[PDB]
Amino acid sequence: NYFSRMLRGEAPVPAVAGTLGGVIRAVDLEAGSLESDYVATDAFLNPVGQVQGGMLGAMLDDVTAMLVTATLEDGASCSTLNLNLSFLRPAQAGLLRGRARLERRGRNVCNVVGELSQDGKLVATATATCMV
Amino acid sequence: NYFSRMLRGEAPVPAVAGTLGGVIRAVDLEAGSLESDYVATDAFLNPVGQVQGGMLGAMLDDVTAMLVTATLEDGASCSTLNLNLSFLRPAQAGLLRGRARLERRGRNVCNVVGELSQDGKLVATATATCMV
């Protein structure tokens, strides 16, 4: 698994995960779930000092695609086709917690849901449609 | 207009637009359209060297929300509720061109579409639902 090589330091984390302060905290391949931390920097802020929605979406993209990748054989690859983002509450600079769950693992499509929390509240959700 | 103050250097560009290399190239408030450049850095790349979908979504978020903001009175504010992103073709590090159009400007909701191109091809599209 590229993913499990990545977890034990034997393959590179994608640069974008570095940029988002992404750190995988939990995986459960039988439950079909995954958890990652993210860091919103002052660089990701709108004029009023909240995190831009799109930047939250990049974290949701990461957690959902990571979960899908975790399930793949070597040689298979996760490609996200659509990502629908709902912005629920404002986020501030600092840590966030991303949680992904597989709603369906198909032969070629996976439907993933992602939730992003900060300070114990949901700030944004996602639905990802991914092909493999 | 906060937006037009921002264009002539008399108000701060949001930090996130800096991060995305965002530079407004065109506005047409009667046509209801707006155009911005974006720069994808090596920091926004997936393992295979293409731009992460979510990072493209943050550019789509910027162009669509910018267009909405351009139309607002002083005191009014643009808040994106949902953003649906479709990923069409892979992008590489470098310049991209974001284009926004208003499909509807309501009393409290604006429906915006965004398209992101690189090297003359659409890489991603968006639909934003925004409240004011």
CSV table of C-alpha atoms in Angstrom, one decimal, chain B:
chain,number,residue,atom,x,y,z
B,1,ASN,CA,-17.4,49.1,-2.1
B,2,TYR,CA,-14.8,47.2,0.0
B,3,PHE,CA,-14.0,45.4,-3.3
B,4,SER,CA,-13.2,48.5,-5.3
B,5,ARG,CA,-11.2,49.9,-2.5
B,6,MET,CA,-9.2,46.7,-2.5
B,7,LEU,CA,-8.6,47.0,-6.3
B,8,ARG,CA,-7.0,50.4,-6.1
B,9,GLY,CA,-4.8,49.5,-3.1
B,10,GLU,CA,-6.8,51.3,-0.5
B,11,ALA,CA,-7.8,48.1,1.3
B,12,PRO,CA,-6.0,44.8,2.1
B,13,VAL,CA,-6.3,41.9,-0.2
B,14,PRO,CA,-7.3,38.9,1.9
B,15,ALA,CA,-4.3,36.8,3.0
B,16,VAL,CA,-5.7,33.7,1.3
B,17,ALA,CA,-5.7,35.4,-2.1
B,18,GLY,CA,-2.0,36.2,-1.5
B,19,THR,CA,-1.5,32.5,-0.7
B,20,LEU,CA,-3.3,31.5,-4.0
B,21,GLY,CA,-1.4,34.1,-6.1
B,22,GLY,CA,-4.7,35.7,-6.8
B,23,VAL,CA,-4.8,38.8,-9.1
B,24,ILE,CA,-8.0,40.2,-10.4
B,25,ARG,CA,-7.7,40.8,-14.2
B,26,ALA,CA,-11.2,41.8,-15.2
B,27,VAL,CA,-14.6,42.8,-13.8
B,28,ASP,CA,-17.9,43.5,-15.5
B,29,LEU,CA,-20.6,44.3,-13.0
B,30,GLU,CA,-23.3,44.7,-15.7
B,31,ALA,CA,-22.5,41.4,-17.4
B,32,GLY,CA,-22.0,39.9,-13.9
B,33,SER,CA,-18.5,38.5,-14.5
B,34,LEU,CA,-15.0,38.6,-13.1
B,35,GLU,CA,-11.7,37.1,-14.0
B,36,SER,CA,-8.7,36.4,-11.7
B,37,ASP,CA,-5.3,34.8,-12.1
B,38,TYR,CA,-4.1,32.2,-9.6
B,39,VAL,CA,-0.7,30.5,-9.1
B,40,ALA,CA,-0.4,26.8,-8.0
B,41,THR,CA,2.9,26.3,-6.2
B,42,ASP,CA,4.9,23.1,-5.7
B,43,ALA,CA,3.4,23.2,-2.2
B,44,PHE,CA,-0.1,22.5,-3.6
B,45,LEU,CA,0.9,19.3,-5.3
B,46,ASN,CA,-0.2,15.7,-4.9
B,47,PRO,CA,2.3,12.8,-5.0
B,48,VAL,CA,2.2,12.5,-8.8
B,49,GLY,CA,2.9,16.3,-9.2
B,50,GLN,CA,-0.5,17.5,-10.1
B,51,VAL,CA,-2.4,20.3,-8.1
B,52,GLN,CA,-4.6,18.9,-5.4
B,53,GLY,CA,-8.3,19.3,-6.3
B,54,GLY,CA,-9.1,21.1,-3.1
B,55,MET,CA,-6.5,23.7,-3.7
B,56,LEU,CA,-8.2,24.4,-7.1
B,57,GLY,CA,-11.4,24.6,-5.2
B,58,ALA,CA,-9.9,27.3,-3.0
B,59,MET,CA,-9.2,29.3,-6.2
B,60,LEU,CA,-12.8,28.7,-7.4
B,61,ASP,CA,-14.0,29.8,-4.0
B,62,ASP,CA,-12.0,33.0,-4.4
B,63,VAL,CA,-13.2,33.9,-7.9
B,64,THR,CA,-16.9,33.3,-7.1
B,65,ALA,CA,-16.9,35.1,-3.7
B,66,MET,CA,-14.9,38.0,-5.2
B,67,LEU,CA,-17.5,38.4,-8.0
B,68,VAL,CA,-20.4,38.4,-5.4
B,69,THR,CA,-18.5,40.9,-3.2
B,70,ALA,CA,-17.9,43.2,-6.2
B,71,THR,CA,-21.7,43.6,-6.4
B,72,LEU,CA,-22.3,44.4,-2.7
B,73,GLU,CA,-23.2,47.6,-1.0
B,74,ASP,CA,-21.0,48.8,1.9
B,75,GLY,CA,-22.0,46.9,5.0
B,76,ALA,CA,-23.3,43.8,3.1
B,77,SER,CA,-21.2,40.7,3.0
B,78,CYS,CA,-20.8,37.6,1.0
B,79,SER,CA,-21.1,34.2,2.8
B,80,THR,CA,-20.7,31.0,0.8
B,81,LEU,CA,-23.1,28.2,1.9
B,82,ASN,CA,-22.3,25.5,-0.5
B,83,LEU,CA,-19.6,25.0,-3.2
B,84,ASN,CA,-19.7,22.1,-5.6
B,85,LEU,CA,-16.5,21.3,-7.4
B,86,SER,CA,-16.0,19.2,-10.5
B,87,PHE,CA,-12.5,18.2,-11.4
B,88,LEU,CA,-12.2,17.7,-15.1
B,89,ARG,CA,-8.5,17.7,-16.0
B,90,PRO,CA,-5.2,17.6,-14.1
B,91,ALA,CA,-3.4,20.9,-13.4
B,92,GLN,CA,0.3,21.5,-13.0
B,93,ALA,CA,2.2,24.0,-11.0
B,94,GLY,CA,2.1,27.5,-12.6
B,95,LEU,CA,-0.5,30.1,-13.6
B,96,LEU,CA,-4.3,29.4,-13.9
B,97,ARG,CA,-7.1,31.6,-15.0
B,98,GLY,CA,-10.3,31.7,-12.9
B,99,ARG,CA,-13.5,33.0,-14.5
B,100,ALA,CA,-16.8,33.7,-12.5
B,101,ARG,CA,-20.3,34.5,-13.8
B,102,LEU,CA,-23.5,35.2,-11.8
B,103,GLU,CA,-26.3,32.9,-12.8
B,104,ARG,CA,-28.6,34.7,-10.4
B,105,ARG,CA,-28.3,37.7,-8.1
B,106,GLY,CA,-31.1,37.4,-5.6
B,107,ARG,CA,-32.3,39.6,-2.7
B,108,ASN,CA,-30.3,37.3,-0.3
B,109,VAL,CA,-28.9,34.5,-2.5
B,110,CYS,CA,-26.5,34.6,-5.4
B,111,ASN,CA,-25.8,31.6,-7.6
B,112,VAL,CA,-22.3,31.9,-9.1
B,113,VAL,CA,-20.5,29.6,-11.6
B,114,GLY,CA,-16.7,29.5,-11.7
B,115,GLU,CA,-14.3,27.9,-14.3
B,116,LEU,CA,-10.6,27.3,-13.8
B,117,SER,CA,-8.3,27.0,-16.8
B,118,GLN,CA,-4.7,26.2,-17.4
B,119,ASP,CA,-2.9,26.2,-20.8
B,120,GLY,CA,-6.2,26.8,-22.6
B,121,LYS,CA,-8.1,23.9,-21.1
B,122,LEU,CA,-10.7,23.8,-18.3
B,123,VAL,CA,-9.3,22.0,-15.3
B,124,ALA,CA,-12.1,22.4,-12.8
B,125,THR,CA,-15.5,24.0,-12.5
B,126,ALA,CA,-17.7,25.2,-9.6
B,127,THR,CA,-21.1,26.2,-8.5
B,128,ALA,CA,-21.4,28.4,-5.5
B,129,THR,CA,-24.5,29.3,-3.5
B,130,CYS,CA,-23.8,32.5,-1.5
B,131,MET,CA,-25.9,34.4,0.9
B,132,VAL,CA,-25.5,38.1,1.5
